């Protein structure tokens, strides 16, 4: 169904459509 | 004898502890509630006579056969001991109202109830029906928090008998 289109989570050599989920943000702590 | 006051004191004592804000807050509830309770008590007290005769009769009207010969609603002594018994219940209801807890009911009517009723061939159904009737009429003697209090204790007796 959308299974063919699904392995497109690998994107490119290095291309991920935006924002890498949760991202730690340590500046407050420092 | 279970009251809000005795309960909090019991709980303090058993932990070897002075009464603290938790326990005094509790006590304030019991004292704040006294007005409604005691209004219910006064109304149940002065209507006692008729509340009792009303409920006694209703036991016979709901269980017609009780009043036939050879039965337990027949003759002066059965019918006398019945009025007395409902009167005992109303009496302890007023006491529980005044006391701020079920203690008087627990100690003088609930503890032992079933054993006694079972040895003497007394059906709880009668007593529930006496109390259901008393509950119907107390609907128009009281209202608001005095009625809620009266209800609380009448219902408490009905659950004790089921």
């Amino acid at each position: 169904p959308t299974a063919g289109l699904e392995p497109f989570v690998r994107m490119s050599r290095m291309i991920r459509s935006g924002v890498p989920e949760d991202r730690e943000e340590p500046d407050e702590l420092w | 004898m279970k009251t809000v006051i005795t309960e909090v004191i019991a709980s303090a004592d058993s932990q070897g502890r002075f009464l603290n804000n938790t326990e005094l807050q509790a006590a304030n509830g019991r004292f704040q509630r006294a007005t409604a309770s005691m209004e219910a008590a006064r109304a149940l007290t002065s209507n006692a006579d008729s509340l009792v005769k009303g409920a006694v009769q209703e036991v016979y009207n709901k269980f017609p056969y009780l009043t036939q010969p050879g039965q337990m609603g027949y003759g002066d002594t059965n019918q006398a001991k019945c009025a007395r018994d409902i009167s005992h219940y109303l009496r302890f209801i007023t006491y529980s109202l005044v006391a701020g807890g079920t203690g008087p009911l627990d100690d003088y009517i609930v503890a032992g109830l079933r054993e006694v009723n079972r040895t003497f061939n007394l059906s709880p159904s009668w007593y529930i029906e006496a109390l259901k009737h008393i509950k119907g009429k107390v609907g128009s003697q009281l209202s608001g928090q005095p009625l809620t209090e009266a209800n609380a204790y009448i219902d408490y007796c009905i659950n004790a008998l089921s």
């Binding site: - | 006051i5 004191i9 004592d13 002075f18 005691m38 008590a41 007290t45 007023t94 006491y95 005044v98």
Partner: protein, 172 residues
């Protein structure tokens, strides 16, 4: 256990009666003064440690024999027992004060107490005195507290005193 209402109820029941209009209003008055009562119990709870401590300092100021060897508040073990008993009695007096009845005090604390102390060799007259000192200071606190509404607490101060005096009498 009894409180002032429960006591009324027991006496009524022994007559086979609903509470007398006499008894009803006596209890209506107890509800009337109950905020003051809560402050009075709170006065004791809020200063329990100092009440015991101050009673103690003064008891041994007067009776310097108790803290000598041979004395019943010597060595540390015995002093801790004596301090503990001061707390126990102050505790049951506060319970009686919340209840409006002495019974918890008489039944759970005072009953047998004198005979215990005599068996132990604990000088009952000294224990009675420690109770008299707790009374002085406790009432002090009942009468002069933190931002309580001004009024008359003498009825409650008396009643508290009789609980202290019951204990003293029972023990001496």
């Amino acid at each position: 256990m009894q409180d002032a209402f429960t006591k009324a109820i027991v006496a009524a029941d022994l007559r086979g009666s609903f509470l007398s209009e006499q008894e009803l209003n006596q209890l209506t008055n107890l509800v009337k003064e109950s905020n003051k009562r809560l402050d009075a119990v709170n006065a004791i709870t809020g200063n329990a440690a100092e009440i015991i401590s101050d009673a103690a300092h003064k008891l041994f100021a007067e009776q310097t024999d108790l803290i000598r060897p041979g004395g019943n508040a010597y060595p540390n073990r015995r002093m801790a027992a004596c301090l503990r008993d001061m707390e126990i009695i102050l505790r049951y007096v506060s319970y009686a004060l919340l209840a409006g009845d002495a019974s918890v005090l008489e039944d759970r604390c005072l009953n047998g107490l004198k005979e215990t102390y005599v068996a132990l060799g604990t000088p009952t007259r000294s224990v009675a005195r420690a109770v008299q000192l707790m009374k002085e200071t406790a009432i002090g606190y009942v009468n002069s507290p933190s931002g309580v509404t001004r009024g008359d607490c003498s009825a409650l101060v008396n009643e508290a005193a009789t609980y202290f005096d019951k204990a003293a009498a029972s023990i001496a």
